[PDB]
Amino acid sequence: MATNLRGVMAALLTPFDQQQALDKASLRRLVQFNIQQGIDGLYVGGSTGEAFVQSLSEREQVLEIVAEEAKGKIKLIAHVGCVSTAESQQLAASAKRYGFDAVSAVTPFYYPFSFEEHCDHYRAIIDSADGLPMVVYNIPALSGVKLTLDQINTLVTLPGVGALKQTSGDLYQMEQIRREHPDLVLYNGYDEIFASGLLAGADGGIGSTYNIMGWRYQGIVKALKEGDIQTAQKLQTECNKVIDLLIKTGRFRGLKTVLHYMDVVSVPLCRKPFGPVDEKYLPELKALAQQLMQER
Amino acid sequence: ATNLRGVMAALLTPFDQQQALDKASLRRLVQFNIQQGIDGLYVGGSTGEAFVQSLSEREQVLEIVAEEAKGKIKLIAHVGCVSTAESQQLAASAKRYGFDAVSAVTPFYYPFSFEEHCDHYRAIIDSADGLPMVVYNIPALSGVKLTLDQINTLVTLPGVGALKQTSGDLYQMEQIRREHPDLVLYNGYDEIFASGLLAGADGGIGSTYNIMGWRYQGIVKALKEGDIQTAQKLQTECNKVIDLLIKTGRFRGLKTVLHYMDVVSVPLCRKPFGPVDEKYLPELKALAQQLMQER
Amino acid sequence: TNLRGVMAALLTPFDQQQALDKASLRRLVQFNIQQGIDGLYVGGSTGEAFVQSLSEREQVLEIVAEEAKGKIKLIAHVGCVSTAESQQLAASAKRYGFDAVSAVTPFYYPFSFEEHCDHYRAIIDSADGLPMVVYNIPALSGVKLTLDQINTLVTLPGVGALKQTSGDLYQMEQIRREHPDLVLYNGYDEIFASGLLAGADGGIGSTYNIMGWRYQGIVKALKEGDIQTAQKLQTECNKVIDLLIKTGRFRGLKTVLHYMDVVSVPLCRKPFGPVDEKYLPELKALAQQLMQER
Amino acid sequence: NLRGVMAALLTPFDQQQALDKASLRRLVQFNIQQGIDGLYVGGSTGEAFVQSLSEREQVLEIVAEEAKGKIKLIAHVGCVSTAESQQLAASAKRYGFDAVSAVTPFYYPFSFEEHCDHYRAIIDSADGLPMVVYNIPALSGVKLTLDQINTLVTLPGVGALKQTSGDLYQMEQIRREHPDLVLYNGYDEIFASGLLAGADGGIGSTYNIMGWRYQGIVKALKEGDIQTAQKLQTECNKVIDLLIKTGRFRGLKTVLHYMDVVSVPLCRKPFGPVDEKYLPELKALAQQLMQER
């Protein structure tokens, strides 16, 4: 329990004010809101936090504030990944300094790097994490990095690696990873297949939609544990109706908008080049916010 | 049953040393499947090596399988060819032989518009003279990438009664189920069967069902009884087998296991498919004996 | 001589009931010859071979040989997914007197590179002496070969050429560098001029049926160091290809040939559909333009 | 006039991975001395994506001090963030660059409309310096259609397109649709063919060590001498063959190191060092190129 990273953890969004600067008050509210719905932990500074449109200092500012708000209460994983190894090392040291339970790093992107280079990248960050377990981050869709199973097996067996965030829809590979690593903490990365992902071998998950309905995902975990497939399927279906909408509106901004109507986020904008939500979607988003609030 | 839902084995085509149809082995394999308690057979698809077969050779298999299983288990005839006219010929034969349904892969190699794909299916449905159509979506091998909207249009064409979904995208599997509550939806990738059912599929069609169809029936049963653990354990066992078949070559590996089970005389596939590497024989023989003992 | 040159990928004319239109096939063969084409690539993608039976493909090979053997070079594409079917067509091509055979990498089912090699070897054996033209077309076949694999295939005993249907002109140059004497056919008409500059010494294309003389003109212009002329010819070819891509390439070509009084009924076989009637004006005008120019 | 052959500048670092100002200046002067038409600074080749904004500005400022008014200077100010890209664009203006450039924002999926506003905003901050749209699908993961490309290149303020694509049919289509557009060939290994298809110049990393060969191909084709153009492209490709084996940027830095231009031939981590088995070939190449010109 004290060091168990297994569970349902929300990929935290980063609230900005009207001038696109960090909205500290809204960030703190989002953190407490997540804690309030019984989330197991928070994955901070990942893709969902718009880390790649933030500077290093801005990312450390978020990490620091989140730690003040939730250290001790729930598990905290800091995504310190950057294309640059040096930059990633700086964020890792900060994460440890702030008291995070673990660090994570997306496979470095844009430039083609050999597998050996990817491995040394992780080793160097692990060194700077000085004790904090590393969560390997496999998300080929956005990174463009396509690892094989043998390569994935090598990464998760590196000293200091304590988990794998599997943002892949291949549930055959999910089962193979579980079979090869019975004790590995394995996070399902695509919210829209959560139930199936757990059935294949994942033992938890990390996702952006957890910010507005994390309890549903917890419900699925419970349902599958008790053998209630009907309930598990029903919950996944409701999640997917929501995801269908968020894909039309834009996932991050759609979530920020729902959180805005829930009185958590002051201004629901993402950073440019991200545009605003198309006004034609507001009635559905408002209706969803109302529904979720009644449900919770 | 009075419907097409269920666990259907994708039938393999046994050949002799001369690469010619081995009827004796074909009949044995059909009876073997029936004995395993399978719900039906999907004949003339990828697994039956239909694409390295002539139209008349595919028709010959359809006739014999009908003679062996018609009235005993459901029979689905895959009549798909790149050509619409050739697909129609097989559909007419399937009707004459008394199959319960026809199926057709999205025509491949040449790029065709979605409208042309739709007219392709309409033409075949016409020739099937009443038999329902099972749309066959397998982007990995066909190279045809349909959107969800296109899949919805295809499954709602007059005469279409089901969809064989050979795709590992379980978000799409759930979306299809949500849009069509009564649709017969077969899971296509054996290695994700359990997850596929949980996502919305209500059955499946697979090549590995030939040697362990009872395991898949078991997963269906377990999930219906809310026994998640048993369903997972069964899927894990199937995947241990699939891992092996992928190393040896799936079709030839399956035929080799069937050989050791005294079903298939000569486990060869047709060229350009090569033989199984002899270094795998020990593992394949051990698997066959393990499966026979299991039954 | 040799197999280098501008070879037209032959189309297969059909009658009202989607059956071979023998009279039109003969006219198309003679039409190509009159354009001054160096040879014909028969039974390939362009001939709609993949929607024809072995018997139908053989019939076409036999007719074409009757019409052009001894007048121009003839390459028989005998490729099928099945090796045995491929060998049957190879044996027939030999019987009819074709100058060479060709085969697309077997598709649909995934095959190991060794299986691909054994496939070509078996067909070469059945070609009984005729040189093999390896056919690399990843876009349609789905088979993605590496340079080392391409090198291996082109040096197999019996291989005499390569039809490179790829827009990767770096690989085109590398292939020419590794094999200075290899017959190298440019497969994408829309980059013909650039392909030759990169290393190809000829080409095979469907659009050669209606404007082969233009490609012959590009070969000549480059040979004589006339870049501007080569560029202008390519631009004119691309203006045509732009249109053909909108209308559908094969049916668009057959429709142009119809207006040229060569093809009776310009339909392709189902599932291919007819040309959208809104394009008829453009296609007819193009036919008119080409006849004037020619 | 932005037409021409321009080297994608590399960013030299020291043993501790920090900018090596003296080598940076040496490389700029080296390019000038060998006759390059201009420099493309802060692009993929300059390892901009493993640098901070302040570090990229530092490079832009130094290069400007070294070559403004001597050769054309194009600043790649592209970042995923629009705001960040604008800061660099404003700086490029202050330093006196002749133009700015921006790769299509990556990692996160953006709508074409969002891509358009991104460029408009950067163009606004460039305060007068024309924009060079940068299409490179292989690395950005952004696949634009011809129509979208046409829309981008017609935006107010855009004066050129760096086409890093091996599709020469599209290259010809772009040239046909835009007769006067400055179109840079992006893949050095197909330079000759890219020019024949419609490019009227190029931008590339290998220009740092053999820019004159590309200048030679331009001349050859203009003079209708195919033979020489092909021979030159072939020699360039023999070199590119090697650089792909060693790793392009570090291979180039190594050659430049043996030519006494770059003090330390390292790229920033995660890039690893050059495999020692390749040094004999790299030393020989350096010797060859120094004796050649």
UniProtKB/Swiss-Prot annotation, chain A:
Q: Where does aceneuramate bind?
A: 47-48, 167, 189, 191-192, 208
The way its activity is modulated is described as: Inhibited by reduction with NaBH(4), and by Cu(2+) ions, p-chloromercuribenzoate and N-bromosuccinimide. Inhibited by beta-hydroxypyruvate. Co(2+), Mn(2+) and Ni(2+) stimulate activity, perhaps by enhancing the opening of the substrate Neu5Ac.
> Pathway it belongs to?
Amino-sugar metabolism; N-acetylneuraminate degradation; D-fructose 6-phosphate from N-acetylneuraminate: step 1/5
Principal EC category: lyase
Q: Which GO terms describe its cellular component?
A: cytosol
Q: How does activity depend on temperature?
A: Optimum temperature is 80 degrees Celsius.
TM annotation in the entry? none
Question: What does changing residue 137 to F do?
Answer: Retains very low Neu5Ac cleavage activity
List ligand-binding residues for aldehydo-N-acetyl-D-mannosamine: 167, 189, 191-192, 208
Under Pfam families, the record lists: DHDPS (PF00701)
Compartments where located = Cytoplasm
Q: At what residues does the UniProt record annotate the site feature described as Required to correctly position the proton donor?
A: 47, 110
Q: Which residues are listed for pyruvate binding in this entry? A: 47-48
GO BP: carbohydrate metabolic process; N-acetylneuraminate catabolic process; single-species biofilm formation
Q: What is its EC number?
A: 4.1.3.3
Catalytic function, reaction form:
aceneuramate = aldehydo-N-acetyl-D-mannosamine + pyruvate
Keywords attached to this Swiss-Prot or TrEMBL record, sorted alphabetically, are: Carbohydrate metabolism, Cytoplasm, Lyase, Schiff base
User: What SUPFAM superfamilies does UniProt report for this protein, alphabetically?
Assistant: Aldolase (SSF51569)
| MF term (GO), any | N-acetylneuraminate lyase activity
Give the recorded effect for residue 47 to C: 40-fold decrease in catalytic efficiency for the cleavage of Neu5Ac
The impact of changing residue 167 to S is: No significant change in kinetic parameters for the cleavage of Neu5Ac
Q: What does the UniProt note on pH dependence state?
A: Optimum pH is 6.5-7.0.
- Active-site feature positions: 137, 165
- Entry's family note: Belongs to the DapA family. NanA subfamily.
What's the protein here called?
A: N-acetylneuraminate lyase
